[PDB]
Amino acid sequence: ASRLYTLVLVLQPQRVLLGMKKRGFGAGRWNGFGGKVQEGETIEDGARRELQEESGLTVDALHKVGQIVFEFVGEPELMDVHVFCTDSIQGTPVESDEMRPCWFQLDQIPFKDMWPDDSYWFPLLLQKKKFHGYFKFQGQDTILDYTLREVDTV
Known part of the structure; x- marks a missing residue:
């Protein structure tokens, strides 16, 4: 079992928008915008919701650029x-x-x-390559295992 999350990167030709997470999981790090997908919304609709709640922004179109699976030891x-x-x-x-x-x-x-x-x-998001990633963390700082590859369909 996995739990669905979203992450949205606003990537313009010469700049990318990040947010400093103020509270909860990942507090004190810059990241894209996102969170848990809720019951009764699609994954994309949850990504739009989270971008709006966290940044106030709305978007015309979201493009799928990747999927990353995270294992946290003991969760x-x-x-x-x-x-x-x-x-x-x-x-x-x-x-x-x-x-x-x-x-x-x-x-x-x-x-x-x-x-x-x-x-x-x-580096892959910046080069406009679609990818699948997996990372196993021990706590919030140490990656123990990872895989990363480019894909044609996300």
């Missing part, structure tokens, strides 16, 4: 993360209770203050 549910991108946003990002948004130049992405798996798969 029974795997996280099945569906990764989306958009260039097209509507509105100005604003801070929420969960996230403080900020734009980053593509050569200044703050990997040292991001989940450690991001260093591995971001």
